[PDB]
Amino acid sequence: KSRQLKAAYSIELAQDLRAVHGMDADAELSGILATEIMLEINREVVDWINYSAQVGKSGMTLTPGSKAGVFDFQDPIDIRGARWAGESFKALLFQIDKEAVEIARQTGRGEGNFIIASRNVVNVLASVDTGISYAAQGLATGFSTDTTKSVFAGVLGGKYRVYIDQYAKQDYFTVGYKGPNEMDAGIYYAPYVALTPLRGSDPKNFQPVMGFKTRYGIGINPFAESAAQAPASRIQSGMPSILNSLGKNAYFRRVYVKGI
């Protein structure tokens, strides 16, 4: 599947802009177009990871008296009777670790080894002692809590690569598994053509034009659902949809969080 963007800018603007602000107008616009395309693409991948994720803290990962899908810091069951943040934040770590195990149970490839989460979740992780200790809390240390300098925040317990979803809609974390192979991720991004510039001008009025075009393709790992014994129709699309990835991808589990 393709993507493309155009600039199509006027001459008089470039002339006046240079005269007054010193900007080129051509260079600025080509910069923007190429940049925008890559930003849009990266978001597409993240959205598919969450789209296809299973509901976490569900089924075999539930405490029977729980709310079925959300980790609530104000709920004494979810926080295991914990007090202050020093004992309570660790309860979230327990649910995270429990989710990672469930990912291994369903994928058969490995335990969740990365976390994509909201800024609030990461600040919670950064501000708590994640090792085994009575309790502890304080100013955030181990994980960047920013998004400005980097998306990658740090490694949780030396176990999970934590990234911040700078656009998290609510507040949540997704625990996911990624193997060493490009065939072991559940979600794939497979580029074919990228950022080929096209240039010209319309020979009636000579106004310059330009734009860029790409072609990628995405897909779902055979066995991503994992539970199914067999696919329908034998020869099937690997492109994600309602009938093949939504809420099914064994590589990911999304747990909502509340009470932070």
């Binding site: 199509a8 006027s10 008089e12 603007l13 319309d202 009636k204 009025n205 106004q207």
Partner: protein, 52 residues
């Protein structure tokens, strides 16, 4: 003659003026505009013959 008299009287007078820059930037349908072509020019090369 009538036109010249009105010019003499200042009733109707000669004028010359360019295009707004915003009109010129849109000619020949740039950006969805319409019916706004550039004015154009060419040549005619003709001849005459003389017998003796």
């Amino acid at each position: 003659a009538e036109i010249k008299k009105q010019m003499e009287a200042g009733a109707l007078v000669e004028i010359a003026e360019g295009m707004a820059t915003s009109i010129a930037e849109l000619q020949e349908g740039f950006n969805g505009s319409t019916d706004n072509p550039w004015n154009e020019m060419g040549f005619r090369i003709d001849k005459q013959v003389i017998e003796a």
